[PDB]
Amino acid sequence: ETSLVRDLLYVFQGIDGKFVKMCNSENCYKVDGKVAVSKSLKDITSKLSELGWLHNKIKKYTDQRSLDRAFGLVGQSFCAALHQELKEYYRLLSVLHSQLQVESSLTLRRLLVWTFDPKIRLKTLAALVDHCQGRKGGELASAVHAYTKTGDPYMRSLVQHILGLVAYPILNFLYRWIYDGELEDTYHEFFVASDPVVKTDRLWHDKYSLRKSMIPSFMTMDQSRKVLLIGKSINFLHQVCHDQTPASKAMAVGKSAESPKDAAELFTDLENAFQTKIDAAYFDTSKYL
Amino acid sequence: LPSQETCLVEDLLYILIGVDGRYISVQPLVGRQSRSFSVEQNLDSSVKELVNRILPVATNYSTVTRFVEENSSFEYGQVNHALGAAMRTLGKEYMILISQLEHLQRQGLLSLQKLWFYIQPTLRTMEVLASIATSLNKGECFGGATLSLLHDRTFGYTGDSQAQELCLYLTKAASAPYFDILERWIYRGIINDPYSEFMVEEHWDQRYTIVQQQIPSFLQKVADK
Structure with missing residues (x-):
């Protein structure tokens, strides 16, 4: 009983504990090698099978790429999320x-189900990882936006945390290139x-x-x-023998306001209000030019 | 012979958390609508019926959670996805009470009749999400007609509080996405179509067209307004 409770902690932290399971793929099946025990033990060994395997698949993806500086933009900002929801699996591993130990000790069907909330949490990260094998940005932004058109705000809130973070390098390309326009690309x-x-x-090339x-x-x-049209006009006013950001230093106040607004804001990526005040910069920089 | 009454209990509590037990084998099938669980032969005809009584309550939850927790996470991100993720949110606290029961199961203090009276408010909690789970997979309904069905379900339901309490809540938490993008559409006027979520779509004016298969749930005058 309790020795199988002790075995199920070690595959939650990773690879096999008391015995050897000899499978890294398709689920991590517990082999006890006992026939005189009841056959009902074996199916809970098969409940553990996809708990531990779905955990090590999240270790498999972030360690097979083995962090790379090439394509080191939006891809690993997606991994920095992938470590924070790796983190959330571990906090329920400590209550278990x-x-x-003593300070009750028997873990029964109560925790047998407690475990399926990590399961649906890890299936959310499993559907999140099966979309993207590569770590190049741009195509990651069409990936998590295809996951928020799905309804049911259980994992839709979780991928909304990702689209607010996948976009956060993407829109950090934007408003500085609207406000100062100093080019900062390495892999586009x-x-x-x-x-x-x-x-x-x-x-006009x-x-x-x-x-x-x-x-x-x-x-x-x-x-x-539209953002090409503001980005083309902001470079044409650098070589007009003026280094002045358009018509005021209020373009530099705007970037600071936006960075504090992002700091204060929970996880949401704005796109209906984000497109509004770039009109107020596009009409601004065109009349001054 | 007294040990076999606890030996089925510990087999049962791992079935309750939606995963495979020791000797209670689980049969998976596509389109399961509460897949069956095969119990072992036992030594006493009374004690099997008590685990045969709790088992549909373990069966009907574990299935109707399982596909709505995964098909929603696979799907788009429409109102059916915020609906199914809120079923997953309610499924977090269901696994908490099982584990606090297992803190009392470090030594045997409860029997099978003590298990069912504790999960008696929660078996009514899961089973009105069960009838949602069957229709939305047979129909595979679209987001305008999802909320139209989900509205009608919590409406011809009375008789219990806490079942009526949730089946309002998550449909209200599916209607509240809808009202906000309605309010983005009636004030600012920018529509966000991920795939589609409205009867009204862009394109002597031919600017807007209506479909009657994506109508909202309320009486048809307000959809026309």
């Missing part, structure tokens, strides 16, 4: 051992790759392509051409 994490062509004098294969799904098509 305080049940185990945004859909606007800034300066991939050699610098030439301006003949398009250096900032929008690249359909990496568009976020919260940014529609008329807004992707």
